[PDB]
Subunit: 338 residues, 2 copies
């Protein structure tokens, strides 16, 4: 009842082929247990070969199927890579069909939600040059699909992030910080924040790209979602060395971070605490700038906060502010799930 | 890089290979939040949830220890536990005969309930409230405290989450625990009632109709300063409603005690007595005249020269009010 459906993918009739494709696509959208049922039937080689069919009715339905399989576990995503789906997806990034492009874009986005070596498979397939060019797309829908796929690639290791920088994505991402589209502005902040989660060289690339003035300006944003992602980006830059933490300080972010410690939004408060705690993970010149901003006094009052999880986070930062070391900063790598 | 090696060991049939991997992963997640997402990155959640039905009680305890450390992270890391399907199991474990297993299942629910309001409603929609209210009459005061810790965090959500606690019959048993001889049972009872009083005016009136005011006014003369603090929060959230709710506090005789508490050497007690009177000052003149008739004018003027500058401002902010604030507390497993 299910192994016979995969045999219909070889049927030359477009009705039997699409009828079986819609059947295998819905069963895929169930649980991960139903995804493995499709995989162990031998459906991946047929779906990959259908990605080269000149019939867009089948190519679009085959993209819906392979995307739902890639929405499962990492060991199921790897099965898509070993089936040869990545070279077909990268070549489909130049299709004149707006829907075929966006479906192949979200397919790479969900593929890139796996491990670092599964993201590295996307990079080695050549999807980066097409994604960076798509950052300049005037179609904001195409731009969102490209931003979502690129940001998940930047959530890998230091080798994965450096490949995004070597492709030249930082100039477009920094320019996208001035976009009127709130969703585009949020996606660009996550991509920039994921890049600042690498080594000190990947962090200095964001600094040399001129992102700090826009990040500090976005701290006064009336959109709390933009303020959230802008806070994570500044904290990741504060997770590097002493010179990179000083760049955040020299940008003028401390008077805004300390004032956010009194925000009635508990989610916003913990992020400013996470940012100041990362800044406190620096040399004595960096710890002094936090004290001169009047944070020792606000951190002591937060030990009486109604949320006990906030009290502990204020104790950890206060210990790092009064210590003689400089370690303890933490990074963050976020995914953009579709 | 031995983290994925430990995760694959969660499928090992040997106990001391399985129990060794659960302990290392639990103490790794016991660190910071960056250490927690690492454990989540390797995919330990689907195996930790599966092992919640493990007939081995020691393996079940190690799995509950690990999941509770993961749920102690950020709100987005809590949703990863919820999306893994742990709430249905955690509610199933609320009927376990083992008291230790029951206590560890209550912690995970308590740590999860420290997230957003919609994350609290997921704990509610999973059927946790009936088991929690039924556990409020447990003779084990450590089981009762862990059930009170979870209920108090659930009542810290929105008005929909608070009304679900009220509709579960928690108000009667909560007032019963106000006369409890246990100090930590009493605090969690005051916090849960104070979190219920943080809702709408019809949710504050449910606390008033439950007969909580006479026990709260008596607790203002408690020798235990920790109990006196949480009791002041309960009366303050009740005075945050309308004029009919503020008058219920005055009619309970709280004004003579609140004015006297403005002279407690404990600075925390003093500021909480101020926040209560400031909320009472948010009513009509009939409520204001009762305040200054209780001798609150001259004490607010003496507080203008107190050594704490944040209390000086709060003194005149309430002094000019005579001539509207809530608090949602979230407690951590301890």
């Amino acid at each position: 009842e299910l192994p016979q459906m995969v045999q219909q993918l070889n049927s030359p009739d477009q009705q039997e082929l699409q009828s079986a494709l819609r059947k295998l696509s819905q069963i895929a959208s169930g649980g991960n247990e139903q995804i493995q049922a499709v995989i162990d039937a031998g459906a991946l080689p047929a779906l990959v070969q259908l990605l080269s069919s000149p019939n867009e009715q089948i190519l679009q339905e085959a993209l819906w199927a392979l995307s739902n399989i890639a929405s499962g576990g990492n060991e199921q995503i790897q099965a898509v890579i070993d089936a040869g789906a990545l070279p077909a997806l990268v070549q489909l990034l130049s299709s004149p069909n707006e829907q075929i492009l966006q479906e192949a874009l979200r397919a790479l986005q969900q593929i890139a939600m796996g491990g670092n070596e599964q993201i590295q498979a996307v990079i080695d397939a050549g999807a980066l040059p097409a994604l960076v060019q798509l950052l300049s797309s005037p179609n904001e829908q195409i731009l969102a699909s490209a931003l979502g796929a690129l940001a998940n690639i930047a959530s890998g290791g230091n080798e994965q992030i450096q490949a995004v920088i070597d492709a030249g994505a930082l100039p477009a991402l920094v320019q996208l910080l001035s976009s009127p589209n709130e969703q585009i502005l949020q996606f660009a902040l996550i991509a920039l924040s994921n890049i600042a989660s690498g080594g000190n060289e990947q962090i200095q690339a964001v600094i040399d790209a001129g992102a700090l003035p826009a990040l500090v300006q976005l701290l006064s944003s009336p959109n709390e979602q933009i303020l959230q992602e802008a806070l994570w980006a500044l904290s990741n830059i504060a997770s590097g060395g002493n010179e990179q933490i000083q760049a955040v300080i020299d940008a003028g972010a401390l008077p805004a971070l300390v004032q956010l410690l009194s925000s009635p939004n508990e989610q916003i408060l913990q992020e400013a605490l996470w940012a100041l705690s990362n800044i406190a993970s620096g040399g004595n010149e960096q710890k002094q700038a936090v004290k001169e901003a009047g944070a020792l006094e606000k951190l002591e009052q937060l030990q009486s906060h109604e949320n006990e999880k906030i009290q502990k986070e204020a104790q950890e930062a206060l210990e790092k502010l009064q210590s003689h070391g400089s370690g303890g900063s933490g990074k963050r790598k976020a995914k953009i799930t579709w």
